[PDB]
Design a protein around this nucleic acid. Structure first.
Ligand SMILES: Nc1nc(=O)n([C@@H]2CS[C@H](COP(=O)(O)OP(=O)(O)OP(=O)(O)O)O2)cc1F
Lengths: 398, 548
DNA sequence: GGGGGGCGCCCGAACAGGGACT
DNA sequence: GTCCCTGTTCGGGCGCCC
């Protein structure tokens, strides 16, 4: 099969990211997988005159004895020369299948190959790194689904005609499949498709919570209560211009003890009623724009609770939600946090068919030390680390 | 001989051309070492006489080796290096003896004239023209001085050994440049037979292994260590004894100490390291501070002691133990059976303007984890001087994701603790201070002060200051004039973000004074309010400190 | 004495991103 | 906008290995 020429963005060079250290488990899996892929023409050994490199690692799926190689092509994808269904976000069930295997059947433009180099490390540096290069469409490169789209459309073609109200969507190595079939018939449907895919060679979108901002109800308000209140509202009013603060702020006339209780005037009692409602009405006027990135922000609320907001322009939230989890001993913030970004990435792909840039409330080294131990997705969002002002923490609190 | 291995294709950077640079003068002795070496290389086809068809040239020299009798020929290719393409370095780090496993039979072998056994690409040979003054040659093999040589050799060597590795997966070959550690679980006769097979393999590809450099009996000299059978040791470390120290002197002592700390527990270099600040040149001389003075002494005593490390048993566990050293310094020992270190180390990296002990401990744990994964390929278990409750508190009240892997408490002081604890709710019967500060960008003049619910007000004036600074000054002021219990209300996001992270150390003299006060107090409570929104008595204090 | 690649350690220079202010 | 303050990368010395 003749290849599809591909190019980098203009004025851009190939990736040069250093490999990071791997556990013994992972290196053995990768050495094992790679020698096979080399036995099948899918990858070739290369020298160091190829100046490019991209990190690699591996994940062990669920309960299994099978590892998945996972190359981190985020950089490459950023440098690679560049129709999502609104219906998918509305389905009782949505199932996610891993069709990455399919790509190894399509040769990779010879001139491009060099930009996909990677390196396998050794334990305790017993050897120099072993460098490989790709000869087919690599999994995790955004080029792979593009170039394979046409063949993809032929495969799913009659499964779709035969099942015209099952919606099938593809993102990178992933196939999303939604139906309103009761579980069992959805399950029997899914296996039908999988059978259909070996012949060529779970979610619930409808029940996703939106997380409103909310205000304390109290019989006794102190000066401190009211000050906290007013400050939270002053900020909330950047999101909801409806919000008002003047009558409440009037109770903090003078200079008073933090624990002095203050009887709410009926006006201030009134605007409390308003604001409580101006929060219920949805955020007016926010249009998804695919020329810009989805920004995701995450806040640790404690007790295993996590909050987040997806937006593209500050205060213009496309969505705002919450992630709850286990309350006890073995609670691991880093594990919860990577589970959070995986549930959130998943929702974004489903709703807007795109990946968010995460702003993460963790130290960079703490995160890079451990995230690949809790990762289970075939893709990898972009992120940046950010020590979040302890003010926003209280804004989204439940 | 020259390997019949395929050359590695190299090219200059685009639009660039080879180097033209005059040979510089040479010692007579070096000139003779040089032509003895060249007349021999040329004879073996490792170098070729060139003519006027070669425009290029690059200066050469030589230095005695570690055997003090033989010369090493070098080429200052600094210019050609700039115009040579990028490589991806394949050497990902440095092997460490503590990652080796007990072996029944061991051998160490050097490759003879390693580089000069690997051919250099033909199209690139011309750019390596040099001149021996007393003859003009060019390289047919890899030259020592070019930036392509290490990776091309390291990769070439890896090719050559793959066949033998695959044929013999249970012989372990640590491969560092041309140095080979070969280990096996065979009896000494079978092992020696395998070494011969390895030497023939190597010799088939043009790589000789001279007996002169073939170690057969313990202890083995490897990577700067001595490998005995049950233990390993670092070849002796000698510390300079100048009585006048330069920057370079210092830089040369911190290195040898860092080197030492991998097996010498308790090493410290904070006070030495501080000297290195501001010094605009290596030759600058500096007087040892009194505490630097003392520190160097502590380390000198440490080096006198006799110390070794042991090898690695994968059947057992990896345990890492951490000791607090003071001033943001940490020592650790990694082991499997008590009092038999695999290795040791230190962490002394100051990161953050402001920080505290629990943070740094978390940073020490992360460094040790990453390093255990490189050396043994798995995380260790921890023993830390921090109570479960302390860690639990911190995790509970820190607005960030933080975590430590499996660990058990060790009451070996000095224990790690939180030196003060802000309150979650405002304090009954504690004077309430409303603080604030303002500053004039042009004059650098400012004011900081407070107003309290009991009628107190104070305003302090400052010079050469800033907004942030005056906000921090106001707070310090309220701590100074308050009782053992105080409520403080500020509108400064800056100030609230520092203090809420419970620091116990800072770069800032002012934050340090603030920390002192927070430690003395019985209860503090810090609240925030938005500025310029008429919120009394933030409003009242705003007017006061706003005479600018 | 002048060269090279790797890792480590410290440092200061550069530059990025958020807050407060004119 | 600018100024201030904080965090990152990155290059420069030195240590060790070959
Ligand atoms: N200082 C050095 N610069 C180098 O470029 N090298 C290179 C990298 S390793 C290669 C050969 O190292 P060796 O020290 O075994 O020296 P050799 O092979 O040149 O000669 P031999 O082994 O002593 O026969 O030379 C070594 C150095 F010690």
């Amino acid at each position: 099969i003749e290849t599809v020429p591909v190019k980098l963005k203009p004025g851009m060079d190939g990736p040069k990211v250093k490999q990071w250290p791997l556990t013994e488990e992972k290196i053995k899996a990768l050495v094992e997988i790679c020698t096979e892929m080399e036995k099948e023409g899918k990858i070739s050994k290369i020298g160091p005159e190829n100046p490019y490199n991209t990190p690699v690692f591996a994940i062990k799926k669920k309960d299994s004895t099978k590892w998945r190689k996972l190359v981190d092509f985020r950089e490459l994808n950023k440098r690679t020369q560049d129709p999502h269904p609104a219906g998918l976000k509305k389905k009782k069930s949505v199932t996610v299948l891993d069709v990455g295997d399919a790509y190894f059947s399509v040769p990779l433009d010879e001139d491009f190959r060099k930009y996909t180099a990677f390196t396998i490390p050794s334990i305790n540096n017993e050897t120099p790194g072993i460098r490989y290069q790709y000869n087919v469409l690599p999994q995790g490169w955004k080029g792979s689904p593009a170039i394979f789209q046409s063949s993809m459309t032929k495969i799913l073609e009659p499964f779709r005609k035969q099942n015209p109200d099952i919606v099938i969507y593809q993102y990178m190595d992933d196939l999303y499949v939604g139906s309103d079939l009761e579980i069992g018939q959805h399950r029997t449907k899914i296996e039908e498709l999988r059978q259909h895919l070996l012949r060529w060679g779970e979610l619930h979108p409808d029940k996703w919570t939106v997380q409103p901002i909310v205000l304390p109800e109290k019989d006794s308000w102190t000066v401190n209560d009211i000050q906290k209140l007013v400050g939270k509202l002053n900020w909330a009013s950047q999101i909801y211009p409806g919000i008002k603060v003047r009558q409440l702020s009037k109770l903090l006339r003078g200079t008073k003890a933090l624990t002095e209780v203050i009887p709410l005037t009926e006006e201030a009692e009134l605007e409390l009623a308003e604001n409580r409602e101006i929060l219920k009405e949805p955020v007016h006027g926010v249009y998804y724009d695919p020329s810009k990135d989805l920004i995701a922000e995450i806040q640790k609320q404690g007790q295993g609770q996590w909050t987040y907001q997806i937006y593209q322009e500050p205060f213009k939230n496309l969505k705002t939600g919450k992630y709850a989890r286990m309350r006890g001993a073995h609670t691991n913030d880093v594990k919860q946090l990577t589970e959070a970004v995986q549930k959130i990435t998943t929702e974004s792909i489903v709703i807007w068919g795109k990946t968010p840039k995460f702003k993460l409330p963790i130290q960079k080294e703490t995160w890079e030390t451990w995230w690949t131990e809790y990762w289970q997705a075939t893709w990898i969002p972009e992120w940046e680390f950010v020590n979040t002002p302890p003010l926003v923490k209280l804004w989204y609190q439940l | 001989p020259i390997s019949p291995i395929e050359t590695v294709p190299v090219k200059l950077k685009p639009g660039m051309d080879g180097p033209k640079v005059k040979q510089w003068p040479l010692t007579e002795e070096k000139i003779k070492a040089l032509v003895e070496i060249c007349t021999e290389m040329e004879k073996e086809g490792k170098i070729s006489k060139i003519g006027p068809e070669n425009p290029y040239n690059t200066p050469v020299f030589a230095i005695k080796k570690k055997d003090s009798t033989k010369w090493r020929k070098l080429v200052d290719f600094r210019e050609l290096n700039k115009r040579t393409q990028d490589f991806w370095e394949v050497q990902l780090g440095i092997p460490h003896p503590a990652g080796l496993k007990k072996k029944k039979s061991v051998t160490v072998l050097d490759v003879g004239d390693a580089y000069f056994s690997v051919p250099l690409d033909e199209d690139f040979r011309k750019y390596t023209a040099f001149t021996i003054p007393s003859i003009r040659y060019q390289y047919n093999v890899l030259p020592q001085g070019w930036k392509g040589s290490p990776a091309i050799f390291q990769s070439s060597m890896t090719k050559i050994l793959e066949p033998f590795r695959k044929q013999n997966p249970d012989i372990v070959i640590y491969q560092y440049m041309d140095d080979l550690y070969v280990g096996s679980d065979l009896e000494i006769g079978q092992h020696r037979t395998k070494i011969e097979e390895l030497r023939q393999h190597l010799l088939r590809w043009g790589l000789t292994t001279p007996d002169k450099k073939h170690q057969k009996e313990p202890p083995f000299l490897w990577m700067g260590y001595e490998l005995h059978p049950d233990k390993w040791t670092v070849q002796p470390i000698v510390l300079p004894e100048k009585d006048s120290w330069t920057v370079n002197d210092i830089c040369k002592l911190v290195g040898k100490l860092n080197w030492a700390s991998q097996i010498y527990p308790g090493i410290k270099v904070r006070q030495l390291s501080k000297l290195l600040r501001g010094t605009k040149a290596l030759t600058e001389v500096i007087p040892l501070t009194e505490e630097a003075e003392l520190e160097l002494a502590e380390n000198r005593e440490i080096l006198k002691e006799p110390v070794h490390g042991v090898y690695y048993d994968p059947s057992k566990d990896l345990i890492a133990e951490i000791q607090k050293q003071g001033q943001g310094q940490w020592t650790y020992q990694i082991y499997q059976e008590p009092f038999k270190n695999l290795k040791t180390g230190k962490y002394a990296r100051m990161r953050g303007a402001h920080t505290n002990d629990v943070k740094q401990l978390t940073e020490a744990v992360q460094k040790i984890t990453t390093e255990s994964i490189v050396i043994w390929g798995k995380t260790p278990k921890f023993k830390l001087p921090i109570q479960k409750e302390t860690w639990e508190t911190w995790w509970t009240e820190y607005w960030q994701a933080t975590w430590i892997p499996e660990w058990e408490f060790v009451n070996t002081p000095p224990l790690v603790k939180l030196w003060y604890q802000l309150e979650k709710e405002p304090i009954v019967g504690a004077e309430t201070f409303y603080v604030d500060g303002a500053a004039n960008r042009e004059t650098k003049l400012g004011k900081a002060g407070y107003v309290t619910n009991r009628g107190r007000q104070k305003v302090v004036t400052l010079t050469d200051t800033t907004n942030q600074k005056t906000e921090l000054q106001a707070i310090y002021l309220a701590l100074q004039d308050s009782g053992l219990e105080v409520n403080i209300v500020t509108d400064s996001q800056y100030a609230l973000g520092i203090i809420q992270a419970q620091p116990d150390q800072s770069e800032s003299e002012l934050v340090n004074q603030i920390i002192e006060q927070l430690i003395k107090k019985e209860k503090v409570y810090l609240a925030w309010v938005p500025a310029h929104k008429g919120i009394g008595g933030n409003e009242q204090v705003d007017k006061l400190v706003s005479a600018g």
